[PDB]
Design a protein around this ligand. Structure first.
Ligand SMILES: O=c1[nH]cc(F)c(=O)[nH]1
Lengths: 208, 1040
């Protein structure tokens, strides 16, 4: 009677109806005369209690344990590396978005300043008429003010494009995570089954 | 030949998260002189050239002498009618009221200033900036939040903040000093037996100190009083001995004592700890250390009015923000319309087809989990189905929530969870816009309920919008009253059931007389740990005998996981047992604030436990776990928050760590809002400590920016060059301001005075951690430590250390207060940022490697096993020597057990350290519950080399066989078991930490390692032998 017959019970229940002090226990959607008698029968557990579908080389099955483990742990680094990029990008992105809001608010203060001077200066343009001496130098100041706001909107634009280029690269990172993920699970699932076929030799396995 | 001439064609030799931008946008450290456009009321743009570190006083006072050479001068008031303002990097227009501030310290976005006169004439109130700084997001960012809950939190939480400031000025100023300087005291007055016997039948020798004039000289009145006498008594005996005389009768003394006695309080020399209430001196921690360390206390008589001098009045101000229809009426099953995700980033090449898995949950789930068909797969994915959930709508528990996830063909893409009732008790009905969260590293599992409830605030993410069945009216949850009736009805209804029943497991049939085998299968379950999953039989067993289970309060944690929350019948009765269940010990109650106990009645109860039992000492022990448990609370405003907030406002030493633990996680947008709001509230009410926290914050920020430059620009330079740069920068005044007058956040009792830059330096590690060294500016520096030094480390995630060093601290107090003395040195460590923290330096200790580099002789042949012993002998000589080994033997023994139980990363010559006095202790623990086995054990990470074995048995040969080692080997057994009896706590502590994104704690099976290594499934005699066996096989001989 030795296919279905706590911690590594749950590790073989992971991701799959499934089933498997001093007697026996039946576990996924725990349950406490004979053993093989009762499981073949239930293979709907409603009618017992109100609220069971899924049950040669030696040394080169263990080199395949080394090989699928070099694949897996290279493949895991691929995942582990990209997750960081994914987050850094996310982060960097948002800092930009804030900067844009800050740029924006910088501009609004300056646009108001180019407005602010005309009220107070074009009272002094008409009162007295200071002559071409006074107003050539109130003209100089205003010349800068605008050519500065040029520079700011240049600077903000130049950022907004980069947001997109980052944002573009952001999407591309998740794209490739989501293709790498599913293969990573099978590479992992088979490397558990490959080591299950080997196991006693517990202590020979760590090098592969 | 080597490689079979295989070319790797691809490979080309050409080819710490970050980055927190610093003083100006896009640059870390602003150029030493810089140009800044000052904008005036008259629309004129000067462009002052300014030194990096110049104040706004300096800039204004000059700007109003360089604007005189520009037009329209008489359109500007006297400067004093004006104040600067500009855009910050957080992006707010911040009016600059503190003109003592410096230009580097402003966190400008672009280099410019604008003049105005102050609107919002309550100037005082626009020091929300202080709170905004402390928190690192502005308070106005909360004023703009629409959501009622958030605003309803802000206003209603002030209930708590008020009641807290009430309790402070109750019996003032004493009560104020009490808040500020709470007594640091062990929770038990009983003095452990090995501590006692260092006393000659209950006596310490102490040393009171005094000052008369000017402040200059001091004087040592060395008493010898009873361990279990109080500060008052001790203050007297000191004053007796100061003022005995030949010009004074006995009775004349008695009067001159009384009048002097209570004008003084006991300080500790060197740090701002004070002994301010009725406690046996033993019980105050400082004393109990001094006993253990072979030290004579150095206290101090400080004049109550020279202390009440210092405490400022907190000055708490209120801010500017000053028919239903029962769920049980609703007759239908639950259904939910899905509709369409939009932003779904997947390859149409690699991946086949995609769907939206959904479920209803309560921690673990109350129906069959369902999906939709795999529609418009990959390109433009849109469903428009109605998922039908086979739970009736009256059968929803209060806590329940929909969990969902978009999956592929098959593994998950994105997830998001929603509370089925809002915070006002109201079933969710209408249309929702839910933005998803990415899947974590370790999470393969398809759906993710342990994750945070609510939408992602990141806009550019999978926005899966959906619809909720709407019943013509606002569908609320029943009152308590309404739930009591249905419980009593379901009780009376149960009494007249009939003899037999198809599944009479749920019901009794034994009635008021239960069998004696049964009453002791319950207490047999009662004892078992949290992680031992329970069989349905046993649940139904418990659930039937539920009313006897009130005999055994401690059983509750199990009992609750027995109830089916999909049967409101059952649930309603549970609400009434729990209503008035016997209160339990806090160690068992905290289990009931983990993810598996999401109900609010349950969680209320669990607070009622803490309110009653949990002490300001034992709270401060477990604060980390309680702050992490906030993340499993459904709504902002709740009982646990109101508790912790209040304790924090009652006790300024908790307050302190409560800030930093929240402030620590402010980068992590799963809690940025929640914790923000909470910190705001704390910051508004804690009064003057805010100003102390604002200096600590200010300091940590300067350090962050510093290391950031070092780790990016100044790598690929010699240490030598980096070290020039470091000192050159610490020289500057904005730094000297920022880094000198403040409190250590590792422990705010210690002050940090001027920085000696002699002893400040960049360690050799590649992360570039800083070794900083401050003057202790206490009056009695001498009697504690003239120089205080701690390590700042930008780059590493501290919080796995932070936990293990906590866990160790607990194992020590477990062991030691059970009488059995293994001295662990859980050095101080504090996470304050993304990968930013602080580590207490332990002076006069070395890594075993350093020991061997010292004792290594001349020409590099081979290092000796004895070197350690020989270096340790050179330190400790005499009766001293024997005692230095006892210490070593005792610490080695604890650190053997602790290391093994936790499975912390393998120990070797570079991460085990030894002190001059001969205590051994581990640093730099790595990943804890065996995180490196995800790559392909039940490990021994402390494998005792020859080196230790020799030193253990005073230098013998073939050391494994001495008596010296039989002692040691016994300590290990006595220590292994002592923990095992408290293994529930250790489960619950790890269990509460799953809320953090620590990759070593992803879900309960991670924690399950600790079961096998404590061997809880066995009986104790088996464990001992399993432990012996596991210890024998790493060492290769010794353990029978
Ligand atoms: O039992 C208690 N009630 C109230 C308190 F403030 C406290 O510390 N302990």
């Amino acid at each position: 009677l030795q296919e279905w017959y706590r911690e590594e019970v749950n590790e073989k229940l992971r991701d799959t109806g499934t089933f498997l002090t001093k007697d026996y226990t039946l576990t996924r959607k725990l349950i406490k005369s004979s053993v093989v008698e009762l499981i073949n029968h239930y293979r709907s557990l409603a009618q017992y209690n109100p609220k069971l579908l899924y049950p040669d080389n030696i040394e080169a099955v263990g080199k395949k344990l080394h090989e699928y483990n070099t694949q897996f742990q290279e493949k895991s680094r691929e995942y582990d590396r990209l997750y960081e990029e994914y987050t850094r990008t996310s982060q960097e992105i948002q800092m930009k978005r804030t900067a844009i809001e800050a740029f924006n608010e910088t501009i609004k203060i300056f646009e108001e300043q180019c407005q602010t001077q005309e009220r107070y200066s074009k009272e002094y343009i008409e009162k007295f008429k200071g002559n071409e001496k006074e107003i050539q130098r109130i003209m100089h100041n205003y010349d800068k003010l605008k050519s500065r706001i040029s520079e700011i909107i240049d600077s903000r634009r130049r950022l907004e494009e980069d947001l997109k280029k980052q944002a573009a690269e952001y999407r591309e990172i998740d794209k490739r995570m989501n293709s790498i993920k599913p293969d990573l699970i099978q590479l992992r699932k088979t490397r558990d089954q490959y080591l299950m076929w080997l196991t006693v030799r517990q202590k020979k396995l760590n090098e592969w | 030949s080597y490689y079979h001439h295989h070319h790797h064609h691809d490979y080309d030799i050409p080819t710490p998260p970050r980055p927190s931008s610093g003083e100006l946008w896009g640059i870390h450290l602003m150029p030493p002189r810089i140009l800044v456009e000052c904008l005036l009321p008259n629309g004129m743009i000067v462009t002052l050239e300014c030194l990096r570190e110049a104040t706004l006083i300096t800039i204004k006072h000059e700007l109003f002498k360089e604007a005189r050479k520009y037009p329209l001068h008489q359109l500007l008031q006297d400067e004093s009618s004006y104040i600067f303002v500009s855009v910050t990097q957080e992006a707010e227009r911040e009016e600059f009221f503190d003109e003592t501030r410096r230009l580097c310290d402003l966190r400008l976005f672009q280099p410019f200033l604008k003049v105005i006169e102050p609107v919002g004439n309550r100037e005082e109130k626009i020091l929300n900036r202080e709170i905004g700084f402390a928190i690192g997001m502005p308070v106005c960012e909360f004023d703009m939040v629409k959501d009622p809950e958030v605003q309803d939190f802000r206003r209603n939480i002030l209930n708590v903040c008020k009641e807290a400031v009430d309790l402070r000025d109750l019996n003032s100023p004493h009560s104020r000093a009490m808040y500020v300087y709470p007594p640091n005291v062990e929770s038990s007055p009983e003095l452990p037996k090995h501590i006692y016997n260092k006393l000659d039948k209950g006596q310490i020798i102490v040393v009171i100190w005094v000052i008369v004039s000017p402040n200059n000289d001091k004087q040592k009145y060395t008493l010898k009083i009873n361990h279990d006498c109080v500060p008052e008594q001790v203050i007297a005996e000191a004053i007796r001995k100061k003022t005995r005389s030949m010009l004074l009768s006995s009775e004349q003394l008695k009067l001159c004592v009384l009048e002097y006695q209570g004008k003084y309080i006991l300080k500790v020399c060197g740090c701002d700890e004070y002994f301010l209430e009725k406690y046996p001196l033993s019980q105050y921690k400082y004393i109990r250390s001094c006993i253990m360390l072979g030290r004579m206390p150095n206290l101090m008589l400080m004049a109550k009015e020279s202390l009440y001098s210092q405490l400022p009045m907190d000055c708490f101000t209120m801010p500017s923000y000053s028919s239903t229809k029962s769920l049980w009426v609703i007759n239908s099953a639950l259904r939910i319309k899905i509709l369409c995700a939009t932003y779904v980033n997947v390859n149409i090449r690699d991946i086949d087809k995609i769907y939206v898995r959904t479920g209803i949950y309560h921690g673990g789930e109350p129906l069959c989990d369902n999906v939709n068909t795999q529609r418009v797969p990959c390109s433009n994915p849109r469903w428009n189905e109605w998922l039908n959930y086979d739970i009736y709508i009256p059968d929803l528990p209060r806590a329940a929530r929909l969990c969902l996830s978009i999956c592929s063909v098959h593994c998950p893409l994105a997830w998001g969870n929603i509370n089925l009732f809002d915070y006002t008790d109201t079933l969710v009905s209408g249309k929702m816009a839910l933005n998803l969260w990415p899947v974590p590293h370790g999470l393969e599992d398809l759906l993710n309920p342990i994750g945070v409830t609510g939408s992602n605030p990141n806009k550019e993410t999978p926005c899966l919008e959906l619809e909720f069945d709407w019943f013509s009216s606002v569908v609320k949850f029943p009152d308590m009253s309404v739930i009591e009736e249905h419980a009593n009805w379901s009780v009376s209804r149960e009494a007249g059931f009939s003899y037999s029943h198809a599944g009479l497991s749920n019901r009794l049939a034994r009635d008021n007389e239960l069998r004696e085998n049964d009453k002791e299968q319950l207490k047999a379950i009662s004892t078992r740990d949290p992680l031992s999953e329970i069989t349905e039989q046993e649940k139904d067993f418990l659930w039937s005998h539920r009313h006897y289970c009130v005999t055994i309060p401690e059983i509750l944690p199990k009992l609750l996981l027995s109830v089916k929350w999909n049967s409101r019948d059952e649930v309603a009765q549970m609400y009434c047992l729990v209503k008035d269940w016997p209160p339990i010990k806090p160690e068992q109650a905290m289990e009931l604030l983990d993810c598996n106990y999401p109900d609010p009645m349950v969680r209320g109860f669990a607070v009622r436990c803490l309110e009653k039992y949990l002490t300001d000492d034992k709270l401060s022990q477990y604060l980390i776990q309680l702050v992490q448990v906030l993340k499993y609370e459904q709504y902002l405003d709740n009982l646990l928050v109101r508790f912790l907030l209040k304790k924090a406002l009652t006790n300024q030493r908790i307050g302190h760590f409560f800030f930093w633990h929240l402030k620590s996680e402010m980068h992590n947008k799963t809690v940025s809002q929640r914790f923000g709001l909470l910190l705001e509230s704390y910051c508004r009410a804690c009064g003057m400590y805010l100003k102390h926290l604002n200096r600590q914050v200010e300091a940590m920020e300067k350090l962050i920016n510093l290391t950031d430059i070092l780790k990016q620009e100044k790598k690929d330079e010699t240490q030598k060059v980096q070290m020039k740069f470091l000192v050159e920068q610490m020289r500057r005044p904005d730094f000297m301001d920022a880094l000198q007058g403040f409190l250590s956040p590792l422990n705010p009792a210690h002050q940090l005075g001027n920085l000696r830059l002699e002893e400040c330096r960049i360690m050799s590690s590649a992360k570039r951690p800083l070794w900083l060294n401050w003057e202790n500016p206490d009056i009695m520096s001498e009697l504690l430590f003239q120089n205080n030094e701690i390590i700042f480390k930008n780059g590493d995630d501290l919080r796995q250390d932070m936990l293990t060093l906590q866990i160790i601290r607990i194992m020590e107090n477990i062991w030691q207060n059970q009488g059995l003395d293994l001295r662990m040195l859980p050095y101080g460590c504090l996470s304050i940022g993304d990968c930013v923290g602080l580590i207490e330096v332990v002076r006069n200790s070395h890594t075993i490697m350093q020991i061997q580099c010292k004792g290594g002789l001349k020409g590099a042949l081979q290092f000796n096993s004895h070197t350690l012993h020989q270096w340790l002998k050179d330190k400790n000589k005499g009766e001293i020597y024997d005692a230095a080994i006892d210490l070593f033997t005792r610490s080695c023994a604890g650190y053997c057990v602790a290391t093994f139980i936790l499975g912390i990363g393998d120990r070797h010559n570079s991460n085990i350290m030894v002190k001059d006095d001969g205590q051994l202790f581990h640093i730099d623990f790595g990943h804890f519950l065996d995180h490196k086995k995800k790559k392909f054990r039940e490990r021994v990470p402390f494998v005792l080399t020859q080196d230790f074995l020799i030193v253990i048995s005073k230098g013998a040969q073939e050391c494994t066989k001495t008596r010296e080692f039989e002692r040691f080997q016994e300590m290990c057994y006595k220590a292994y078991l002592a923990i095992r009896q408290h293994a529930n706590l250790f489960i619950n502590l790890f269990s509460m930490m799953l809320g953090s994104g620590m990759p070593e704690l992803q879900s309960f099976d991670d924690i399950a390692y600790i079961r096998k290594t404590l061997a809880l499934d066995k009986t104790e005699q088996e464990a001992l032998e399993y432990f012996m066996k596991q210890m024998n096989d790493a060492h290769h001989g010794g353990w029978t």
